[PDB]
Structure 1
Amino acid sequence: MQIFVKTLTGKTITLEVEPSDTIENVKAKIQDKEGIPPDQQRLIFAGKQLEDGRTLSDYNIQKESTLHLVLRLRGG
């Protein structure tokens, strides 16, 4: 199972994930591929921000699903 992650620059990166992986794990993969620390990234899918505790299965993120990587700034 692989999913997609589209950044705000138009780039689309591929991730090798399992349905049991948590949002945290996916953010660690995004960090390994792009370098952004987890606390600085925000993942959107199906209209909602993905929380750390949940799994991909909890959101019905199927094969080849598209995630949206967006900013998670602190105070400006």
Structure 2
Amino acid sequence: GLVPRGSMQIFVNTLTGTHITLEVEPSDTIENVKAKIQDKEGIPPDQQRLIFAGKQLEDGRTLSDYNIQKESTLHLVLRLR
């Protein structure tokens, strides 16, 4: 008996260009998504930026807000400052 996997899967293109697969729901927020990337990659949420269709995904919004569907890829980048 396990908690179920997310109903939809999306990919994240990581810093080395290999993909990770995330178990998610349409209702998941970008913060939830960043927490999943933290679990897989060990990168602090506060350093992550996620790009999809030219938009940088903002905390407080959901996957559904950006009409991100099954098997789309989010592009993970950090910052040079």
Tell me the TM-score normalised to structure 1 length.
0.92
Mean Cα deviation higher: 25-34 or 65-74: 65-74
Inter-partner Cα distance in structure 1 for 2:44 and 2:77: 13
1:73 and 1:25, CA in 2 relative to 1: closer, same or farther beyond 3 A? farther
Runs of at least 5 residues in structure 1 that lack an aligned partner in the other structure: none
- Report deviation, 1:12: 0.6
Report runs of 4+ in structure 1 exceeding 6 Å deviation.
none
Name which of 46, 54, 65 aligns with 2:72.
65
Larger radius of gyration: 2
Inter-partner Cα distance in structure 2 for 1:31 and 1:2: 17
Runs of at least 5 residues in structure 2 that lack an aligned partner in the other structure: 1-7
1:29 and 1:4, CA in 2 relative to 1: closer, same or farther beyond 3 A? same
CA contact (8 A) 1:40 1:73 kept: no
1:20-52: per-residue Cα shift (whole Å, max 9, x none)? 000000000000111101001100000010000
Identity %: 96
Alignment length (residue pairs): 74
Inter-partner Cα distance in structure 1 for 2:71 and 2:50: 16
Q: Secondary structure at the match of 1:15?
A: strand
